[PDB]
Amino acid sequence: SYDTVMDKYWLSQYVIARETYDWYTLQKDYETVGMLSSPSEGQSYASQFQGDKALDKQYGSNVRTSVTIVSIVPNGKGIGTVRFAKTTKRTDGETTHWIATIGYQYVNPSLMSESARLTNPLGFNVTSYRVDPE
Numbered sequence: 001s002y003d004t005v006m007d008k009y010w011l012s013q014y015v016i017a018r019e020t021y022d023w024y025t026l027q028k029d030y031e032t033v034g035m036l037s038s039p040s041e042g043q044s045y046a047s048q049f050q051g052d053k054a055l056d057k058q059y060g061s062n063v064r065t066s067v068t069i070v071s072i073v074p075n076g077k078g079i080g081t082v083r084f085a086k087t088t089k090r091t092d093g094e095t096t097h098w099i100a101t102i103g104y105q106y107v108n109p110s111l112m113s114e115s116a117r118l119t120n121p122l123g124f125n126v127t128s129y130r131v132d133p134e
């Protein structure tokens, strides 16, 4: 009940943050992914925005990828499944569907600063992340 709803919330929040490309919210989404990810999942995500072919450098404000959550199943054992679709346009675009398998946990929220808890009250933490076509 409380746990399932709360897991769905954070799993939802993470996917939206991770799979959205929007130049004007990129920094916030980026830092959100970071705060909610393990160091390894963080650097994996961050690699998209590194180098001469970084997404931001390659898309600027001329592209937007919106995310729509279709369903979420926390398998109760640290693995969550998120079915979602992505729409990309050039500033009705192509729409594709996806399945995100997410390893995640909650770390003791007391181990954060207060500021950190405003972003991550439960210590939600994504240990692994993979997204496959459907």
Ligand SMILES: CCCCNc1ccc2cccc(O)c2n1
Binding pocket: 018, 019, 020, 021, 045, 048, 055, 065, 131
């Ligand atoms: C083609 C979708 C594959 C899913 N992988 C990712 C993973 C992180 C992302 C961050 C910003 C924009 C995207 O299209 C992203 N796509």
